């Protein structure tokens, strides 16, 4: 009996069969074309059964999940689901490990100032008691920021789907393409309001089909030491505008950077930033403000992930 219940569930999720109209016989052509036209006419009327038949045509592509394996002190158990994930792959470890950097954990490596980030500085300290367990695993947090090679090592991955945290080894599953299904709900990418800088706000541009989210990683000096600052942007203005709009955002940084480079010139010092292409939110799906424990976090919906190479801007 219980094996027959599964026979009704598999045979109710099958794809619809393709119509086989025989073009060689006389009456068999007439009765096969008639069942195309007795069936399109019952998929056009606004009745409920016609709408009941209309969704079995499912041309869905699928998310491709990546199973990572991180140390538990470089990745908090208190991470919001939908956090963006990077991968730092400087060398070949002796064991099969990986270093995944969330944008609140990359705030502790960078050391960018809390005047820029007032709320994600209190959060990044209460999860990371010293900030040393991150910085001990990167021996070049000064030579990768001087030469400008830190953005060449990060690969963007996608939002987080599952976090099985343990004492020493944390299993992290991401969604590298498509909309990530939880492990069942659809996990949208969650960014803090502290990092995301909109470009579509203004005082009539086209309502396009799509709007993209970029990731800028910007080299700068603080305390006369090399540091950096990672911000997120969101617009659908095409690639030529946004690179010209990000240069307007960092006008105050470049003018305070080359006061020191007017003294001395190294060719390791000229490269400044890099813009990635993370993914595409659909148009006018507004993000919903949430709070954590009070952390303003924009969670999107239907965020499918992409992957762009880091292109330099200056």
């Amino acid at each position: 009996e219980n094996a027959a219940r599964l026979g009704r569930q598999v045979l109710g999720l099958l794809p619809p069969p393709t119509h086989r109209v025989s073009l060689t016989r006389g009456p068999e052509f007439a009765r096969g074309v008639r069942d195309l036209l007795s069936k399109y006419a019952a998929s056009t009327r606004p009745t409920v059964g016609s709408l009941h038949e209309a969704l079995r045509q499912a041309p869905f592509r699928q998310p491709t999940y990546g199973d990572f394996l991180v140390y538990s002190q470089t990745f908090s158990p208190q991470e919001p689901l939908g956090t963006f994930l990077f991968s730092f792959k400087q060398e070949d470890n002796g064991s099969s490990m990986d270093m995944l950097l969330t944008p609140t954990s990359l705030f502790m490596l960078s050391g960018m100032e809390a005047a820029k980030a007032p709320q994600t500085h209190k959060v990044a300290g209460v999860w990371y008691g010293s900030g040393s367990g991150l910085a001990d695993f990167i021996p070049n947090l000064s030579e990768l920021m001087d030469t400008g090679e830190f953005h060449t090592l990060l690969t963007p991955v996608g939002p987080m789907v599952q976090s099985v945290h343990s004492t020493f080894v944390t299993k992290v599953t991401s969604a590298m393409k498509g909309v990530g299904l939880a492990r069942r709900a659809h996990v949208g990418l969650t960014l803090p309001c502290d990092m995301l800088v909109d470009l579509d706000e203004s005082c009539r541009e086209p309502a396009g089909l799509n709007v993209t989210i970029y990731a800028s990683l910007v080299y700068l000096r603080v305390n006369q030491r090399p540091s950096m600052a990672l911000t997120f942007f969101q617009s659908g203005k095409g690639f030529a505008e946004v690179v010209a709009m990000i240069k307007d955002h960092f006008t105050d940084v470049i003018r305070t950077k080359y006061i020191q480079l007017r003294h001395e010139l190294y060719i390791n010092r000229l490269v400044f930033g890099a813009v990635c292409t993370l993914g595409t939110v659909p148009f006018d799906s507004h993000p919903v403000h949430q709070s954590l424990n009070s952390l303003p976090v924009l969670v999107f919906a239907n965020f499918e992930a992409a992957c762009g190479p880091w292109t330099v801007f200056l």
Binding site: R45, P46, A54, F60, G178, V179, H186, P282, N302, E304
Partner: protein
């Protein structure tokens, strides 16, 4: 006073409530039948349009 006067032009709006009269049998109306064709498919929603 400089040696020239000037004329000054404005525009002003008025929220008016209107009266529409329309006589008997002035227009013949033809009404079709509705039909449902879908045109946006996502992971969350499948939108239709009648």
């Amino acid at each position: 006073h400089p040696g020239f006067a000037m004329t000054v032009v404005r525009t002003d709006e008025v929220l008016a409530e209107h009266i529409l009269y329309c006589s008997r049998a002035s227009t013949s109306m033809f009404v079709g039948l509705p039909s449902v064709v879908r045109r946006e498919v996502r992971s969350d929603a499948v939108t239709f349009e009648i």
